[PDB]
């Protein structure tokens with residue numbers, strides 16, 4: 005609730021109502037709590053690339069008067085050995101087991117980004133890495149996208165849907181789209197997780213074989229007919245993700261371009277808004293025209309990433325010992 | 326004094342008062358440290374940089390600003406620059422989304438985007454730097470675009486004023502041999518600014534290396550290096566790849582007789598040696614010349630902090 | 646002592662007693678001097694990789710209210726030509742002779758990391774690069790590990806030994822350990838240098854051939870029998886380093902795994918603490934069990950890097966013109 009010790013799943017945010025309250029409070033008065041994080045240091049660690057999370061999170065920290073240190077492992081640091089009990093006589097000069105505690109020594113709050121490795125479903129879904137940070141960093145840890153979730157993103161999506169909805173409980177449809185490379189299911193999982201927490205009419209549509217883990221799908225409606233799902237929707241949340249079930253974990257089952265959210269599908273919606281977490285591959289995930297259309301709130305959405313981050317960062321600060 | 330961007334000498338307005346603030350700040354570096362409080366500067370790099378990279382952060386700090394340095398390609402996603410393509414490859418993100426997005430998290434934007442030498446029009450129409458101006462939603466200042474480098478030139482002006490022995494010195498910009506094809510942004514920019522002064526400006530380069538007229542202006546072009554150097558008070562050496570006709574962005578020569586050495590300096594009125602840096606020793610200039618006491622290369626570089634602080638200040642002062 | 650103009654060797658710190666005093670003063674009140682470095686800018690330059698020095702030094706600077714700019718040459722900047730009088734018609738666009746002065750132009754204090762290049766002993770041991778910074782930067786320079794020393798690290802090791810010792814003058818044993826790659830002798834040299842400055846019972850143990858330079862070894866006891874050296878020790882400081890003498894400068898003479906600090910050797914010590922500057926290759930330098938044992942103060946040690954840096958940075962500030 006109001007005792008945030010970490011930020012990885014929607015549960016951590018507590019009551020959505022009051023969470024959204026603070027969100028809009030801050031949208032209105034961006035530097036209202038610029039004094040709260042004074043002399044508090046945030047350490048942002050990146051195991052993967054990032055534009056939005058990278059930029060938005062620093063800004064957020066600044067809104068709170070915090071200190072920010074961005075660390076891109078692999079670049080300026082030493083490669084990390086993730087497995088325990090191995091003889092470190094090669095590629096890796098340092099072991100994750102030392103790295104984590106050490107990083108925790110120089111900051112107050114930690115943000116981590118560690119994409120699913122798609123080498124072993126269990127390792128990814130048990131969220132081994134993000135958890136080792138939680139266990140051994142000795143600091144509050146918030147996700148900048150783990151192997152199976154991306155709360156900071158979803159929380160922002162929530163904020164923008166509330167921000168733009170025309171009715172109390174809109175029809176929000178998350179749709180799969182073709183992509184050339186195998187992507188994590190973190191965003192979809194996370195979106196579903198958050199949408200299920202609302203009372204919106206949530207629908208998930210994807211090709212056969214791309215079923216997401218039940219624990220995330222929840223009791224949301226799954227429609228295999230994209231056109232049917234889109235019917236009368238108020239929000240379209242497009243995002244690609246590699247397979248998850250059985251022998252296809254982390255694999256591309258298809259690149260059926262008929263799923264590319266184009267003008268054809270949008271037409272069937274109730275003049276719905278188009279959303280996407282970004283990056284977005286144009287004419288793969290969505291048409292140039294759709295993303296450029298006025299119903300596309302892609303940027304406003306991205307912008308809200310600063311808010312969700314400022315709210316989470318604030319809560320974390322408020323709970324620092 | 327309502328600066329909305331900073332890409333060409335026009336943006337600075339009256340040079341006199343611009344130089345005034347420059348020296349004001351040289352004297353009292355943190356005089357306006359309170360001005361940029363709670364204002365965030367986003368520096369974006371599409372190319373390498375030491376001086377611009379360092380000097381601009383310091384400048385922002387002098388104004389009490391927040392600074393975020395972003396090196397695309399490194400921590401971010403590769404950008405697709407062309408519109409209407411099917412992004413099914415190398416690029417995960419399109420510039421059309423990237424720009425607006427970056428603008429979302431800052432108050433002022435600084436961009437560095439070297440000429441790509443793939444198409445003269447694309448470069449000279451300054452497509453990229455302009456798309457930032459058009460879609461970032463924030464004031465944009467150049468950290469060197471395809472055809473200009475105001476921050477650098479403005480600094481060169483400051484140092485010439487700072488060191489000149491007479492009111493209107495003879496400033497000679499000279500080409501020099503280089504192993505790789507370099508943009509003409511620095512030369513173009515220097516010429517642009519020198520033409521704005523009332524100094525005796527002269528441009529000297531090998532045949533074929535003529536810069537665009539709009540930049541050359543009505544400056545004197547001398548193809549005989551030794552003749553140009555005669556009695557000069559300032560030597561501004563810099564290499565640049567060809568520009569005209571079928572040689573856009575190409576190396577026409579590496580004639581080492583142009584390497585600014587002791588031979589040419591001797592003919593000048595004990596002139597100062599200047600260069601924006603990086604500089605390849607014994608290519609652009611002799612070890613001895615750059616190391617000589619007439620070489621104000623560092624003082625020059627140092628002034629990059631001032632030009633940046635002045636520009637950054639003006640931009641802040643005009644923020645809504 | 647209160648006239649710090651640089652920080653590269655133990656001499657620069659002055660009286661160890663008062664140095665340790667400030668150290669613990671700051672451990673207790675971390676932001677006590679947060680106002681001292683206001684409007685002062687620190688420039689950290691890296692010619693090599695780093696996690697601890699990279700992170701700990703920024704935090705330190707922040708504790709002093711300073712401004713921090715981290716520069717990783719090679720990455721965002723232009724490759725530097727280190728030799729003078731060459732015709733720069735190749736790989737290098739910029740020369741070190743211009744780079745150094747230029748970097749000094751935009752900051753108040755400079756921190757440099759430049760590992761030994763192992764291309765020429767004299768060049769390394771005369772500390773040419775670190776010195777050129779001192780000579781031409783025009784600013785106070787502190788080492789983030791040069792070719793032959795690493796004061797920031799050693800000073801921290803001192804702090805932690807003082808912090809954990811059970812007696813006034815403990816037996817501290819620095820031990821060599823097998824490694825797959827040729828490492829600088831900067832850490833060993835530096836540790837010896839500092840331990841020789843104390844009145845602890847200092848012992849150095851390494852295989853034949855790995856003798857460190859006399860000027861660093863000082864009059865410390867050198868034991869070629871690891872097990873003998875470990876006997877009754879109170880602190881074990883393990884660290885690998887490539888050869889130094891004669892025709893083997895910067896070369897791996899052996900990878901004898903019998904030196905891997907394991908449970909076998911620890912047993913012979915007076916239940917000694919295990920220390921290491923990190924990065925550490927597990928099961929090469931030290932056993933998983935040893936480093937994970939409770940006698941392992943590896944992290945507390947790393948943590949102290951923030952203190953040593955804050956103290957040094959403070960002293961430097963206090964002496965700024």
Ligand SMILES: CCC[C@H](NC(=O)CCC(=O)O)C(=O)O
Pocket residue numbers: 096097098826828829830831832885922923924926
């Ligand atoms: C703080 C120690 C820095 C460095 N370490 C390395 O270069 C380690 C390389 C490796 O582990 O492969 C050294 O031994 O001097």
Ligand SMILES: CCC[C@H](NC(=O)CCC(=O)O)C(=O)O
Pocket residue numbers: 149185187188189190191244281282283285416417418
């Ligand atoms: C915001 C998170 C985006 C990330 N996507 C990618 O890694 C994109 C790579 C590509 O488009 O090639 C993902 O699906 O988790």
Ligand SMILES: CCC[C@H](NC(=O)CCC(=O)O)C(=O)O
Pocket residue numbers: 469505507508509510511564601602603605737738739
């Ligand atoms: C400020 C100067 C930037 C750049 N210089 C280079 O890119 C030189 C590259 C080299 O020397 O290899 C140019 O000519 O525009």
